[model samples]
Target: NHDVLSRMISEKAALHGLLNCLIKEFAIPEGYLRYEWPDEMKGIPPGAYFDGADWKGIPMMIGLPDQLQLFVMVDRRDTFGSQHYLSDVYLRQAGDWQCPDFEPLVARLLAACEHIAGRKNPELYEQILQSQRLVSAIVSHNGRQRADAPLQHYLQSEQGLWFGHPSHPAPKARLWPALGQEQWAPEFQARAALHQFEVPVDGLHIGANGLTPQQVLDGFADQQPASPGHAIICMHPVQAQLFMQDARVQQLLRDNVIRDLGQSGRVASPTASIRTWFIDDHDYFIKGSLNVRITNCVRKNAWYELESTVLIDRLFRQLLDQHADTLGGLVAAAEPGVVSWSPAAAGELDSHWFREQTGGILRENFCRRTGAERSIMAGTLFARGVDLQPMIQTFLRTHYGEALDDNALLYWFDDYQTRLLRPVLSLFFNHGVVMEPHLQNSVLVHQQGRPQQVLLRDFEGVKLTDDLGIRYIDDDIHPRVRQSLLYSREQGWNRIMYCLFINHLSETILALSQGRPQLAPLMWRRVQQQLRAIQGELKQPSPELDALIAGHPVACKTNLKVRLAASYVRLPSPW
Candidate 1:
C-alpha cells in the first residue's frame, strides 16, 4: 500500500514540477495545456494535450487519453540553453498512469540548470533528491492522519499539509537528514520537549504588544521556575544544539550570564512551519528560530522583525476595535511578545548568530479568538487525498452528506467568498494595512464544513501603505522600522492581489472546478460581482479595485525566476 501511494505522489510531484518550470520560465499560454480532442493517431477521442517546444528548438508533443494512464511523448534530445537531457519513451494507457515519475524530469531540469547557470549544480541536484524522498515519506505516512477528528482540530489541520507549496520545485526539502528527526516534522504529527534556557535580566531584550515579559513567563510558570536575576527563554531542540556550539554562548555559560535549563517537561507539537510549535494546553503558539533554510529564506527571527511584529499587532488590534462592525468575522491573531538574548560582548559574529538563533515569538492560538470546531489551513483545502478527491470535497461530504450536487457546490463557494474576500479587500482599501492572505498564512474557520470566519495570521508579511496620509494609525515609529513595514502603493497592491487572488482564491476555484469545470467562470464572476459591490459601497473607490474590475491582468509572483536568481529579488510584473 505504501509503495503504491509513494509512486502516485512521485508522479504528481513530477507533473507539478514540470508545470511550475514551464509556467514561470516560458510563460506558457494559460489555455495551451488542457484536456482536448486528440488528432489523427489515437484510439480515444479526448486526451491531455501538452503542446510546446523545449529549449533547443525541439518541438515537443505529448498525448495522454483518459483511458490510457501514461503520457506518450516525442521531442528532440538536444540541449537548449541549459536543458540538455531527455527521458526514454514508453507506451502505456492513460488510466494506468497512477504516479508520474519525476526522475527523468529532474535529469532534464539538472541539465538545464548546469547549462544556464554555467556550472554543475550539485547542491540543487541534492536538494531535488531530498525533496523527492520527503514527498514519498509524506504520502506513505498520510493514512495515519485522523480524518474523523472533531471540528476546530487546529493542530491537526496545521500539521495536515503533507505536501508544501505545489509550485515550489523542492516543496518538501529539508537540510537535515530525516533518519533521526522525523518526529520533529509536522508531517509525522510528533510531539517533543522544548530546550529551556535562563538569561540574566540585563542580557535579554524583550518587547510586547499589551503584555509584559513576566506575564508571558507566568503562562508557563507551572513548568519551571526562573532564577531571580534571570528570565526564561525557550528554543527548538535543533536550534539549541546549533547555539550551544557557538563560542560566545560557551563564554556566557562560563561567566554565569546565561544558563542552560535543559528541555522543558511540557511537550509541544510542531506546526506547519516546523520552527513554530503549538502547546495545546497553553492556548498559544511558540515560534522559534530555526537556522536551517526551509525554502528561499532561512527561518530566523531578525531583531527588527520581532519589533515590527509587536507594532503591527498593536496597530491591527486598534483597527479591529474601531471597525468591529465593518470587519465582521475577520480577526488578526495577536503576536503578544517576542523574546531574545544578546551577550554583553555584542557585535561579534557568534553574538549576532546567537541573537538570530535564540529569539522566539508568542502568538495567540486560533481557539482563543473563535470557538471554531475545526480550523483548517487554507492550503490544505486544495490538497488532494490519496483517493484523488480534494480535502474540501471530503469535508463537504462529511458535513453535508456525500450527495453534493452543483447547487450545493455553488452555495459553498459563495459562502467561502463572503467569508474570505470581502474582509481582505476592506483591510486594504478602508485601512492602509495590507495583510498576507497567502495559503499558509490564512486559516479558514468553518462550522460543519462551511466557512464562518477568515482568521489572518503571521505579521511577518504585513505591510502598511507608504502614503502616511492614508494610514489609520498616527503614532511615531522609527524611520527604519517604518520603512521596513511600509510598501509603496503599487508594491502593496500587487502583493495583496497576488496573495489573495492568484495564490488563495485561484487554488480554491480550481479545486471546485475539478468536478464542475464550468463553475469556474461563474465563481470568477461572483468575485467580480463582489468587488464591484464593495466598490459601490465605498465613498471613494480605490484605483486598485478599479483596475481589477476594469479587467487588468493580475500580478503573479514568478516562483521559478525567484529560485533561479537565488536571491530574494522580486520579478518584474508579468501582467
Candidate 2:
C-alpha cells in the first residue's frame, strides 16, 4: 500500500514539476493552443497543439481537453540530441484522471539543460533523484492518519507538503547522507531534543527589542541545569555536530569557556523549513543555522541577518501600530531576539563561522499569539497530495459539502483574495513596507474553514522602499543595517510581485483550476476588480497599480536560468 501510494505521489509531483518548468521556461500563455495533426499521425489521438519558439521545434500536443485532464506529448531533435517520446499520458475515466509518470519528461529537461547551458549537470540529476526519494518517504509516513493523536491544523498543514516548488529541479534535496537525513530532514517526521551549550554571559552576542538574550534563555531555563554565570544556547542537531567537530569549539570546551549541555529539553518538531523548529506548547519558534544548502541559499544566519531581523521586527511593529486602521487584519510574527556565541580570542573568519553555526532566532509563534487553532501555510494550501486534492479544497468540501458549484468556488476565492491581498498592498503602497508574502512565509488564518485573517512571518525577507521617509530610520540603527533593509522602488515592487502574484497567488489559481478550467479567468477578473476597489479607496492612485491594470509585464524570478548561471541576481521579468 505504501509503495503504491508513494508511486502515485511521485507521479503527481513529476507532472507539476514539468508543467511549471514548461510554463516558466517557455513563457506559455494561459490559453488553449490549436494545431492540425498531419496525416502521418493518423492513429494518434485528436487534440490541440501549442507551437511556440521556445519549444525548440517540438510542438506540445494536448489530448482530452474537455475533461480538463489532458495528455501531453512532445517530440523533437535539436543541437543537443534526438528525442521522440511520450512526455506524459493521462488516463481519464469517469470524472477523474490518473497522474502520469514524468521520467521521460525529466530526461528531456536534463538534455535541454545540457544543450542550453553547454554542460552536463550530474549534481542536478542527483538532486532530482533525491527529491523523488524524499517525496516517497514523506508520502509513506503521512498516509497513515493518527485519528487518536491529533495535531493543530497549523502544524498539520505545515508538515503536509511532500513536494515543494513545482518548478524547482530539486524541491526536496537534502545534502545530508541517508543516516544524517533520517535525523535532520523534515519529511521523515523526526523529532529530536535540541543540542544545548552554555557560554559565559559575556560571550553571547544578543540583539533584541524590549527583551535581552538572557531573558529569552531564562524562559527555557527549566530545560537545562542552572549555571550561574553562563547563558544557554540551543542548536539544530546537524549544526551542533558540525560545531563540535571544529577545533575552535574544542578549544573553547577545553578552556571552560563553553559547556556542552548536551541533548536535553522537549523534542522539537521540524517545520517545512528544516532549519526552523516548532515545539507543540512553546510560544516561540527556534530558528537555527544549518550549514546545509536549501534551495537558493545555505540556511545559515549571517551576523548581519540576525541583527537585521530584530531591527526589522521593531520597525514593522511601529509601522503597523501607526497604520492599524488602514492595514486591518495584518499581523506579523516577530523575531524578538537572537542569540549566538563567538569567542573573542578567535580570528574574524573563525568568529564569523562560529556565530553562523551557533546563532538562533526567537520568533513569536502566531498561532499561540492569536489563539487560532487552524493557521495553514499558504504554500501547503496549494500543495496537492496523492489524493489529487489540495488542502484548501478539502476544507471547502468538508465545510460546504461536495456539491460546490462555480459561484460558491468564486465566492470562496474572493474571500481569500480580500483577506490576503489587501493587507499586503496596503503595507506596500500606503506604509512603504514591502513584505515577501510568498507561499511559505504567509499563513492563512481560517475560521470555520473560511479564510479570516492573514499572518505574515519571517522578517529576514522584509524590505523597505527608499522613499519610506524619516520614520523608518533612527539614531540607534546602524547606517549599513538600515541600508540593508532598504530596496529600490523597482526591487521592492519586483519582490512583492514575484512572491505574491507569481509564486503564491498563481499557484492557488492553478490549484483551483485543476478540474474546473473556467475558474482561472473568473479568478483573474475578480483580482482586477479588487485592485480597482483598492485604488478607489486610496484617494491617490498608485502608479504601480495603474501599470498592473494596464497589463504591464509582471516580473518572475528566473529560477532555472539562475541555477544554470550560478548567480543569485534577479533577472528582469519576462512576463
Candidate 3:
C-alpha cells in the first residue's frame, strides 16, 4: 500500500468522530462487500466497464487513491492479479504523511486570507478563511481508509460535502487584494534600481501622452500645407529617445552640436518641463521643455513660461528688421488711448519685446501644471476666458464673410489645397525645424470687422539642420544656436506641413464652411493666391530673399480630404 493511502486513512479516521453531526458523511463496512456488477453501467462512458459479474462499489471515493487506481486497475486486469491488486489498492492509495497535503495548502491559503484581512477589506478576506476551513474538513474526512469500502462511498461522501450548500449565496466582500498593492515592494524596488541607472533626459514639449508634432497635426479638421517658400519657425526636442538610436539623426545632431558636453552629458541644460498655450478669441495651452543645448540658444532671462518665447523673440526681431510695416499698426494698437491696450499689460503682438514679456507671463501663470488640471486651466487662465468656437465663428465671418458656410469651409480648404500654409512648410523643408503649427497652436484674432491677425504658438516641435551647429563654423550666429540644431530638414518639413496645412488650415476651413459653401471655394482661392505670390516674392531672383528659401526642391502633392483628416502629404524629397 502507498504511504498516501495510509495518511489519508488516518486523516479521515479523525474526521469520523463528528460524522453523525455532519450532514455529509461516508461509511465503510468492516466486511468483504461484494455485489453483481451491472452490465450496463450508469453515467459511465462506453468501453469503460469490466465484464466481471462480481464487484464491490466504493462510496465517497473522492480524495482516495484507490478510487483512481480501481478504474485503471480494472482496465488492465489482464496485466496483473485482479484479486490481490484490488484488495490492496485502497490501502496503497491512502498514503502516510506527517500532515495531509491539504493542511499546508490550506495554511498558505489562510495566510493569504490574513494578509487580505490586514488590508483595506479585512473583514471580507477573513470570511473567506472560515469558508476554506470547511473545505479542508471535507477533504480530510473523504480520503479515509476502510478495507471493505467501495468506490461509491468515496464519491458520494465528497460530492455531498461540496454540493451540500448549493443554495448558499457566494460571499463577495472577501477577496484577495490587487497584486499592485500586495506586491508593491518588488515594484518599488525595481523603480528604485532603475533610478540608479543612467536616466534618459525628458524631451521638451513632449506631452504626457508623448505625442509627436505629426500626431497633433493629425487632429486638425481643415489643415493644409504651409505656404511653400517662406521661412517659418519649427521647434522640436532633440532628446535621446527621438534620435539617439538612429545613426543618421545622431550624426546630424553631432554635426550641428551647439554646446560642449555638459556635466550631465547632454547638449543642453535640463528644464523642469515645457508647456504651450494660445490666446485670442479662443484659447489653448501647450507646454513642453527644451534641450539643455537649445536653452543656450535662447537669450537668457528673456522669458521662461511660454514654451516658444525664445523662438517668438527671434521671429519678432527678424520681422521688425525685415517686415517693419507689420509692426506699424501693432504698436499704435497697444497704446492706452488708441485701443485701450497697454504695453505693460497687453503689449502689441508684433513687438518682440511684447511677445517676450507675454511669454514670460504665460510660462509663470499657465504652463506649470499638467493633466486634468492643466486642461481645466486652459479655459480659465486666458485674459477673458476666451472660447474657441465663437472666436472661430467671428473670424470666419469677418475675413471670409457670411457667405462662407460649413460646406464652404470644406470648399475653401479644397481651394487652398496645401498652398496657404507654405510659410511653415518651407521652414520645415528649408531650415529643417519640425513644428506643430496647427490652428490649435495658432490663434485667429478678429479686430472689430477684420480677420487679420494669426498668432502661432508652441515651439518645442522645431528641429534644426545638422551643419548649423555651434562648432560648424558659422560666424554670424551664436555657437550655442548652431549646436542646438536637431532633426532632418525633410522630416521637420513634413511634420510642420502636417500641422500648418493639414491641421490648422483644415480646422479653420471646416469652421468657415459651416454656413457658406460658396465662399469656401473663394476663400481657399484667395489664400492660395496669397501663398503663391508669397512664394514668388521669396523666389524673386533677389540675393536677399534667396537665402530665405530654405531647402532643395521636392515632389509634393495636396489632398484636401486627407488634410482634413490631419493626414500628411508626402513630398518625394526632403524640402
Best by TM-score: 2
In terms of lDDT, which candidate is strongest?
2
TM-score winner between candidates 1 and 3: 1
Evaluated at residue 49, the lDDT of candidate 2 is: 35
TM-score of every candidate: 0.84, 0.85, 0.30
Model 2 scores a C-alpha lDDT of: 0.67
Q: Candidate 2 clashing pairs?
A: none
For residues 1-575, write the lDDT of model 3, one tens digit per residue. Answer: 34444344432322221121111111111111222242323333333333355332222121221221112112111100111112112211233212224344333322322332232333323433333343333334433423111111211111222212111111111122222211111101111100000111111121112233333322211113223221111121222232233453344346632111212211111111211222212112222222222111332212222323344334434543565432322210000000000122223342333223212112211212211211211111111101112123443344455744456445434433333254443443333334455433433232332333333334434455553211222355544443344555444545554454333443344334433334534554554454544455342232212322343222222221111121222321111
Candidate 3 lDDT at 390 equals 19
Misplaced by over 4 Å in model 3 are 1-319, 322-435, 466-484, 515-527, 539-575
- Alpha-carbon runs more than 4 Å astray in model 1: 29-101, 109-122, 144-152, 177-181, 219-223, 325-329, 345-352, 468-476, 566-575
Q: What TM-score quantifies how close candidate 3 is to the native fold?
A: 0.30
The local distance difference test score of each candidate is 0.65, 0.67, 0.27
Residue 346 Cα positional deviation in candidate 3, in Å, after optimal superposition:
39
Ranking, lDDT, top scorer first: 2, 1, 3
| Candidate 2 structure quality by residue, lDDT tens digits, 1-575 | 77887776686665557455434543233232223233243233333233343332244433322323233454431111112223344333234434334664455555554555466766776677777777777767766663211123777666666688766777887785234566766666669888888777766778777786567775433424747876678888778777888887888899888988878754787888989988877878889998877765689898778878887888777767776766745778888888877876777788778888888888887878655467777787777754545556656676666856788888878888877788788878777778888888888777766777768889888887887622576768777677778788778887887777677777777666555645766787788788778777663338998877666766666555556643222222222
Put down candidate 1 lDDT per residue, 468-506, tens digits, no spaces: 313643458666677678788788888888787767777
| Residue 79 CA displacement from its true place in model 1, Å | 29
Q: How many clashing pairs in candidate 2?
A: 0
